[PDB]
Curated annotation (Swiss-Prot), chain A:
Compartment annotation: Cytoplasm; Nucleus
Organism: Rattus norvegicus
Full-length numbering of the shown residues: 27 to 321 of 861
Domain notes: MVP 3 mediates interaction with PTEN. MVP 4 mediates interaction with PARP4.
Protein name: Major vault protein
MVP repeats: 31-85, 86-138, 139-191, 192-246, 247-295
Subunit structure: The vault ribonucleoprotein particle is a huge (400 A x 670 A) cage structure of 12.9 MDa. It consists of a dimer of half-vaults, with each half-vault comprising 39 identical major vault protein (MVP) chains, PARP4 and one or more vault RNAs (vRNAs). Interacts with TEP1. Interacts with PTEN and activated MAPK1. The phosphorylated protein interacts with the SH2 domains of PTPN11 and SRC. Interacts with APEX1. May interact with ZNF540.
Gene this chain is encoded by: Mvp
Length: 295, 197, 49
């Protein structure tokens, strides 16, 4: 049994001292420690001594402590974590978590062992024997006119909350710092091309998808993006850019042949050429190509 | 599983029974059940599909019947977990159809196509943009290769051997010139003589 | 700051709270607050930003 207090407690004839006196296990406020084999306690948190003289012990179970009155180490306990500073957490970061053995949450929410978690923001998170503090994750910064790719590592709801499937990926509209969700998988920022009257974007669809402006684009389709559309356009995860398209403005005395001019139907007319002349100013439609190259 | 032990759900469990727990959590070990294999669900990006052979008689997704050694495509987008009988092969990317490009399928055997047009064994056919934005080859659809478009101007023309008939069979030994602002893929079995004039 | 200690003004102080005393005088050290950084105010001449 453990012994406590100032008294110079002499040993009795039947007994044998284990060791020389030791400082009581203590940690500072907003600091923590973890000890194996916690003793049982009631609502009064009174120690439950066994009749045979052993202290009661929760063997498989662990114990955590922040701060209170200094205490003796009870026999059969095993000190582990000690004098550990409390887990500080800056506003821009987050704490990915896994949890185990279906323990109850402080909010009264049920917590399955497979449940994901992510505390974040300024403060000091409280360690638990249950939850593991699995990962730290600083929120990605995002400058204006930028966007972030995000793959889904599992079935999920994202921002705006519309549904998702595993392996699906999407753009991040939000300006400024952004914290990934527990399922979200960061890739990289995607800078928009800065559209100008002399420049044009040249997208091609990786697959079927609606564009940002509601114009449906069938898989494999190829199209320009110009200044009338946007000041700038971030490529989408399904929008595969080919390259910048130079403008082909020309004076009245210049002209150029153009193979396969775009039709009203939106499909290029194969094998037909069309000269254009005068103070023209236009980007080449996709699939078009010059013959002589301006005359 | 082994020795015909009772299940927690009260379902009878034969020793030969297959099983597959999945999803988040912590599975409970049993002296009865062996935790024989771990299997991560295959991911599937949009416009992709997965082959699956059957290792035994079974019902698959949608539940329509199957036989041993039979194989089928996986329509579902996103992550997909194989069933206990299912045998993964590989993702099958669809060709991205464009006005200038055309698919050139040949039937490995008799089967209905995705669009309900029956195709007899050994038949050979094009697939174009009017059909689909893109078309994943089926397990019985054996692709040969991409077919270039043969659009030509009004002043160009080309002979074409064995033009396709109304009957759907090529007319052997007959040639047919075509001219003008034509724009078409060659029908299967067709071939040029001079190669455009 | 740390461990959610009360402020002299009676304002609640979260452990994550930022702080910045400044100006002439002598700041009072606390076991709670750490005097983490000194920061001289940047000078700015006219027609500068």
């Amino acid at each position: 049994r453990v012994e406590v207090g100032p008294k110079t407690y002499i040993r009795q004839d039947n007994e044998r001292v284990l060791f020389a006196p030791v400082r009581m296990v203590t940690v500072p406020p907003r600091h923590y420690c973890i000890v194996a084999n916690p003793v049982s306690r009631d609502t009064q948190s009174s120690v439950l001594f066994d009749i045979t003289g052993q202290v009661r012990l929760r063997h498989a179970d662990q114990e955590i402590r922040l701060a209170q009155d200094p205490f003796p180490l009870y026999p059969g306990e095993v000190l582990e974590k000690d004098i550990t500073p409390l887990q500080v957490v800056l506003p821009n970061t987050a704490l990915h978590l896994k949890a185990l053995l279906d323990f109850e949450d402080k909010n009264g929410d049920k917590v399955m062992a497979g449940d994901e978690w992510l505390f974040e923001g300024p403060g000091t998170y409280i360690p638990q024997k249950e939850v593991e503090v699995v990962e730290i994750i600083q929120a990605t910064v995002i400058k204006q006119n930028q966007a972030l790719r995000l793959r889904a590592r599992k079935e999920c709801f994202d921002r705006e909350g519309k549904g998702r499937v595993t392996g699906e990926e999407w753009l991040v509209r939000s300006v400024g710092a952004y914290l990934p969700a527990v399922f979200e998988e960061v890739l990289d920022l995607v800078d928009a091309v800065i559209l100008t009257e002399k420049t044009a974007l040249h997208l091609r669809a990786l697959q079927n998808f609606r564009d940002l402006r509601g114009v449906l684009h069938r898989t494999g389709e190829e199209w320009l993006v110009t200044v009338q559309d946007t000041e700038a356009h971030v490529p989408d995860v399904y929008e595969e850019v080919l390259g910048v398209v130079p403008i082909t403005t020309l004076g009245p005395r210049h002209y150029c042949v153009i193979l396969d001019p775009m039709g009203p139907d939106g499909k290029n007319q194969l094998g037909q050429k069309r000269v254009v002349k005068g103070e023209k100013s236009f980007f080449l439609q996709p699939g078009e190509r010059l013959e002589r190259g301006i005359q």
